[PDB]
Design a protein around this ligand. Structure first.
Ligand SMILES: *Cc1c(COP(=O)(O)O)cnc(C)c1O
Ligand SMILES: *Cc1c(COP(=O)(O)O)cnc(C)c1O
Lengths: 393, 394
């Protein structure tokens, strides 16, 4: 019955044109409506502006012109195009690990979490799957698929002490979490988790979707940066279209010289086997973005991002102020107030996506902003002016 | 189940050693593959049943959509807005199938996004139905039984047992049946007449997987179900793949009637991959639009005729499992896993790539899985038959 008012907001969101509408991509991180209104996108997941990189777009087209086919042997043969190998080898040199590409980070979780619960990745010993409470939904929805294979226990957020207790009462334990948490700005306790891993052999499973391109040298990620080189007990899934400037997702199996984890997941029954690989333009974009991630352009993009983050925090008060995570939340009074503010900001040249029930709790709606390197200093200052004029009048 | 892993992984290694599994080949015009060593072989196992993976109209449209939009993501920086290209793609598929259709990155993501919602009764008047899975149902759906078991009672009947399905329909209020429209292994089709009748009598929700029926079966390629059904109702749902014949990328959910938007909105606002998982990139959407327009032209009945012509030529020259079917999937039973891998290696070195073994198929039932397509020429099929017959002698 609670759906009575939940979907009631969705219809109010689609009516005002600030949710479920149609806008065109315009250079400069800008969206254009059919009527001619141009606004600056303040919620784009492309944290480095690589979705507008002319190098990446040309490489996607160049790969499609060369191979003259969309399928890289997806939904087809167990063979593979050289493009797909060059793509997974590019991600391999970038991350320093054995990497496989999939059509989405969600497909990576579907292909890894169950077989991880089977012990095939932990020397036949079925581990105890420990999920964080704030783990992403593409992983937590598969808890039952994991439960049919071993014991599943959900602990509260960053409860390192409760996790260590299960590591003492069981021989093999695994922890599934996010490297970077969007809602809350919290981070995975790497120092505490690497201590448990060095003692009990705790298996680590990180979702690096909000961590891949924005954190670490060469944009290797929060986990891979503070760790140095991945081991045989750490596994990463990530999305390659949120800051990486490409498409699909990837499984970061482990050590580059070790083919055992890739073989075990390949020959298992999962999306890595039956589902379709990425199309040629995505693979070409992955290659070019991997080369771009290894050049001096990426640390320059990270600097402009941190620069834009500091500018935003000094001009606008938002939940998450002071983070290194470029996600800010302008918590508004109600869902109706959330929708009307977005409509006002758009007519003055700024789109900010609205969150509400049931995505967020009742009475806790607001506008979800995301900071990217491609935003200019004038864009952020002008947004803070429009945001301040709304509050007063 | 734990000792057989020694003999199974031995077949994977041998298949990779012989070069017929997991090696790197380049796509060549004319349904062909090229090795780094210059060997060119005809691909006798492609899923592009109409040869639309080589269509210059579709390829050019995929390139055009990428230059025009100058971005890869169709979700406007992955926000909850959408590019006009995506609305045009779902509208093109909607005009083709005559139904309300949404696109996803894969047909697997469609099952992950629909089967839990259907099991919760949110699509069946709030009454949680009994999920009745077919035994031969695809793994992208069968692996989600536990996700459905948390929402309702889940049963698995034997293949096409319409009698056991009718019994569940009369012992429960609401019941749904998850199956494949066309089964690749076995050449078996769905009992639509019996299924439609149980739907008319009990209200049985029909959940079809048209992955091997789209483009290959029906006027304008609307699928096996939509051809014999006419127009979809509000108790039938389809999921399909757009790379196994449609000539593009990704998958799609065929919710129901074009006018009704309730099923689309229920799944969009539900905790499903249709919400958080990334949407198809621009070139995939540009290809979908062009293939949709191509499906509505006279070229598709022409390609369907060329396909059936090649099925008849193949069946008249090669004895294979499924001979006489209208589905372009043949299986050359060789039994021995070693004979299968060696037959594939011999055929490749003679110009034709075709192999299934344990654990993909049961032990002693290994063989070569061939797939007929419109892009195959008469000489391609005749020459393969000559090579396949000289393997029988020596
Ligand atoms: C091969 C096949 C699929 C493939 O799904 P994708 O993820 O799009 O590759 C889905 N369903 C059935 C019945 C199939 O045979
Ligand atoms: C956004 C996000 C994803 C997205 O996954 P895709 O399937 O690639 O769209 C996955 N995990 C987390 C933690 C995310 O924030």
């Amino acid at each position: 019955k609670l759906r009575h008012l939940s979907d009631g907001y969705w219809d109010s969101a689609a009516r005002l044109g600030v949710h479920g509408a149609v806008l065109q991509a315009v250079p400069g991180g800008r969206l254009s409506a059919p009527d001619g209104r141009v606004a600056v996108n303040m919620s784009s997941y492309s944290y480095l502006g690589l979705d507008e990189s002319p190098r990446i777009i040309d490489a996607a087209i160049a790969a499609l012109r060369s191979n003259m086919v969309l399928n890289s042997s997806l939904g087809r043969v167990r063979m593979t195009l050289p493009l797909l190998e060059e793509a997974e080898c590019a991600l391999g040199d970038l991350f320093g690990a054995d990497v496989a590409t999939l059509n989405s980070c969600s497909a990576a979780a579907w292909a890894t979490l169950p077989v991880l619960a089977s012990g095939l990745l932990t020397d036949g010993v079925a581990p105890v799957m420990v999920f964080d409470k704030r783990a992403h939904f593409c992983m937590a929805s598969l808890k039952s698929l994991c439960a049919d294979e071993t014991r599943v226990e959900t602990i509260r957020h960053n409860d390192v002490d409760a996790l260590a207790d299960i590591c003492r009462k069981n021989k093999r334990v695994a922890y599934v979490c996010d490297s970077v948490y969007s809602t809350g700005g919290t981070l995975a306790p790497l120092e505490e988790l690497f201590a448990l891993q060095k003692e009990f052999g705790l298996f680590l499973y990180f979702d690096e979707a909000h961590s891949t391109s924005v954190i670490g040298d060469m944009g290797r990620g929060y986990v891979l940066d503070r760790m140095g080189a991945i081991n045989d007990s750490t596994m990463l899934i990530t999305s390659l279209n949120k800051g990486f400037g490409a498409s699909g997702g990837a499984i970061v199996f482990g050590p580059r010289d070790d083919d055992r984890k890739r073989k075990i997941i390949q020959r298992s029954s999962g999306p890595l086997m039956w589902s379709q690989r990425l199309n040629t333009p995505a693979l070409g974009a992955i290659i070019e973005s991997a080369k771009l991630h290894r050049s001096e352009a990426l640390p320059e993009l990270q600097a402009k991002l941190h620069s834009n983050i500091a500018l935003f925090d000094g001009l606008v008060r938002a939940a998450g102020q002071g983070n290194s995570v470029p996600i800010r939340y302008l918590e508004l009074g109600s869902e109706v107030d959330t929708l009307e503010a977005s409509a006002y900001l758009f007519d003055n040249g700024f789109y900010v996506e609205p969150d509400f029930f049931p995505i967020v709790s009742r009475g806790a709606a607001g506008l979800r902003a995301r900071i990217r390197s491609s935003m200019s200093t004038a864009d952020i200052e002008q947004f803070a002016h429009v945001w301040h004029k709304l509050g007063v009048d």
